[PDB]
Ligand binder design. Structure first.
Ligand SMILES: OC[C@H]1O[C@H](O[C@H]2[C@H](O)[C@@H](O)[C@@H](O)O[C@@H]2CO)[C@H](O)[C@@H](O)[C@@H]1O
Ligand SMILES: OC[C@H]1O[C@H](O[C@H]2[C@H](O)[C@@H](O)[C@@H](O)O[C@@H]2CO)[C@H](O)[C@@H](O)[C@@H]1O
Lengths: 440, 444
């Protein structure tokens, strides 16, 4: 028995490793926490393969897609444990009447400002152009945040009416997509204008923004509670407040519930549930993670009634209420990827705001059709890379269809040692398919 | 079924498999390796489905025409006889088992169809096909029939089709041209029209098969039949006093039967290849081995020089050799599989009346020239969205996993709605299909 944990690199993974080493002292079970990049994308590729984690930590929005593929184990908490966490966090990890993860903490973006460079932060977005010009004369800048991840750009886009999927009477409408309406265009136009008027740089990312704010070079940034730890060390005199309003409407950040899912085929399910229920989601467990990087508003009632007395957590909750909970439907991946493309292309000038958001809408409504419209041209006649050629040969053998002579000539000419190892990998792929189903 | 330390042999049911079983018993006594002879139906079709799976034979006995297709898929082991053994067999039978400069089987016997006639009912067999309609009416007046043979396999219908120029693939400069198919020329139309006229004019019945034809001749109900040397054994016991001669001519041109060289191939993935080579070279392809098979059912003109020089003094073997020269050796190229399947449909449909002779052979010709492109033009409509039989959708899901391609939402929920183990056993067959692919690849 052993536990392998995956968590994002901006969260307190060292603190989590301490509760894991607490677990090991008590149980003798090894616990390993890793922070791979794009782990939310890697998980469906490694689930049920033995190459993945027993426990995956990410915002709740990605877990519905995992569940629809049958990759997440359904959790079975006791009523007593169920009541230890806030009902709002349990709903974030519910998908088709089943719980598919343990909710950990509520995270929401907030405005972080340098009190020495700006004692009175702007209440509206429109104050920032005039405010940037004034600080630029003093060798500073008004605002810097990560423009290349749509999580950070969305609060302004949704402010005046942008939305992902329309939500009417308890269900999401996967075909009513609102990334291309008037309010979305209004917010994204304003953001591009800031870049054209040299108030922001379109290439700015997370590290540049956070380094700039912690170096006292920018007055404001937009970030979540995890950022507070490094501002503390940097001794920047900072505050956390509500995001500026746009066209009088408040900014509407997408609210994330950090959640821990278990691989449906993991041999260590009961060890995973025990670690999550009895070690991490306790006062001491979450305090260990919180000390490394702040979790935000935790789902555990006892600890959150103490956390709620910090004005930074109060600001997070207030920004969180102005926003909305992220959907957990599988189409969210298409939503994020399309919106990431649109905001970067508009900010860099490769498309207009109207061209960028329309394409973003077409991706979303067309993505449920899958990554493949039709086998690559000439594949069933033997044209293509050998790995894809062996895949289609395996397919035709599975279906008892006689392959073309072009395929058979490719089948005869491929190297013995290379074709064998490729086809052994195919067997490892089917081995995973078997485990996913047997875990149902 | 395939196991190490034993040999499993597949041979057609009309051949002398009991005689072959006796040489296998002799092999077992000498070596301790048990030999098991089986005669499943459609074994020439079943072998490619079971090759390299352990459910097939170590040795397959069939005419050479099917072995080139087996070789193109890498299912046949390459043969490595010494030059000394090579000269024990006639050089031309080795040509029947040569494919892409490699030998892929052992030649056993040369088989050719011949005209078998009841000497008591007809002392002077016809020289031309056109004599038989007039010959039938006279025997029908006595309650008999002139000719009945297996119409359901084109092997028997082909000698009359090829007489006036029907051919499989043209032969240019020692090579076979896959794109010049001669199933639709005037002579092909001419020969099959004659055969349909016989059925219209109630000289033959389109439903006649091997079992019906052979029963009547052995019961003295028909004067003539068309069959190969394997058939002589049942006519001997029946005490019908018969003869074996040349097939009648049609439009002055001789009948050109496709000649088959009965051959033994070895599975490219067999653990008993050395045992197979040793059994084939040292026990069966000997005077004693082939005589044991020939006593059960006649092999025809064997490829082994020493034994055939005794066989050739039999007039029936002379007639078999004679018809063999009037015909041509079959190509062993993979498209022969398409050719035979195609002219089987054409001859059955024209004989049963479902199409005209000219349309039947034209469509027969198109299938032959289209077979290189494979059995699939494109995936069934809606397959990538989850619509289709359960096995093919899970196959395409496996394919998208192999290639790291995101599946559609229709595919994902079909994946969610499938029976838990109905999918698990479908996927285990997938696990073993790849296991077979691996053995085929590693067998080179
Ligand atoms: O930007 C798209 C991205 O947004 C969210 O990711 C957040 C995450 O929730 C936070 O914990 C933190 O790691 O910042 C991320 C943005 O870089 C969604 O959770 C994610 O699915 C989506 O792709
Ligand atoms: O009829 C199609 C069939 O013809 C030949 O098969 C022969 C075989 O050669 C003989 O040994 C004997 O078994 O009669 C068979 C016909 O019933 C071809 O060799 C074969 O490929 C083809 O399918």
């Amino acid at each position: 028995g052993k536990l392998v944990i995956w968590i994002n690199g901006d969260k307190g993974y060292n603190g989590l490793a301490e509760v894991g080493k607490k677990f090991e002292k008590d149980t003798g079970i090894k616990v390993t926490v890793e922070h791979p990049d794009k782990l939310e994308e890697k998980f469906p590729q490694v689930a049920a393969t033995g190459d993945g984690p027993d426990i995956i930590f990410w915002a709740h929005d990605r877990f519905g897609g995992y569940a629809q593929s049958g990759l997440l184990a359904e959790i079975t908490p006791d009523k007593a444990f169920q009541d230890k966490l806030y009902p709002f966090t349990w709903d974030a990890v519910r998908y088709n009447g089943k719980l598919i993860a343990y909710p950990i903490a509520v995270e929401a973006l907030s405005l972080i400002y340098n009190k020495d460079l700006l004692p009175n932060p702007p209440k509206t977005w429109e104050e920032i152009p005039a405010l940037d010009k004034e600080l630029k004369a003093k060798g500073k800048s008004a605002l810097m945040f990560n423009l290349q991840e749509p999580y950070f750009t969305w609060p302004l886009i949704a402010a005046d009416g942008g939305y992902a999927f329309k939500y009417e009477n308890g269900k999401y409408d996967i075909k009513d997509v609102g990334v291309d309406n008037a309010g979305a265009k209004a917010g994204l136009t304003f953001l591009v204008d800031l870049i054209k008027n040299k108030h922001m740089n379109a290439d700015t990312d997370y590290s540049i923004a956070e380094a700039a704010f912690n170096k006292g070079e920018t007055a404001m940034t937009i970030n979540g509670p995890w950022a507070w730890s490094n501002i503390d060390t940097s001794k920047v005199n900072y505050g956390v407040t509500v995001l500026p309003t746009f066209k009088g409407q408040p900014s509407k950040p997408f609210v994330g519930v950090l959640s821990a899912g278990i691989d449906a085929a993991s041999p260590n399910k009961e060890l995973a549930k025990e670690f999550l229920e009895n070690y991490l989601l306790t006062d001491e467990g979450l305090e260990a993670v919180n000390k490394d990087k702040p979790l935000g508003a935790v789902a555990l009632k006892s600890y959150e009634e103490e956390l709620a007395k910090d004005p930074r957590i109060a600001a997070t909750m207030e920004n969180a209420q102005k926003g909305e909970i992220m959907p957990n439907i599988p189409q969210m991946s298409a939503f994020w990827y399309a919106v990431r493309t649109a905001v970067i292309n508009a900010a860099s000038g490769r498309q207009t705001v109207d061209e960028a958001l329309k394409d973003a809408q077409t991706r979303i409504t067309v993505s449920p059709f899958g990554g493949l419209k039709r086998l690559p041209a000439g594949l069933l006649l033997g044209h293509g890379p050998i790995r894809m050629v062996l895949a289609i040969l395996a397919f035709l053998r599975f279906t008892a269809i006689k392959p073309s002579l072009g395929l058979i000539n490719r089948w005869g000419s491929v190297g013995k040692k290379e074709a064998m190892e490729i086809i052994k990998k195919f067997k490892k792929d089917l081995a995973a398919m078997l485990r996913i189903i047997n875990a149902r």
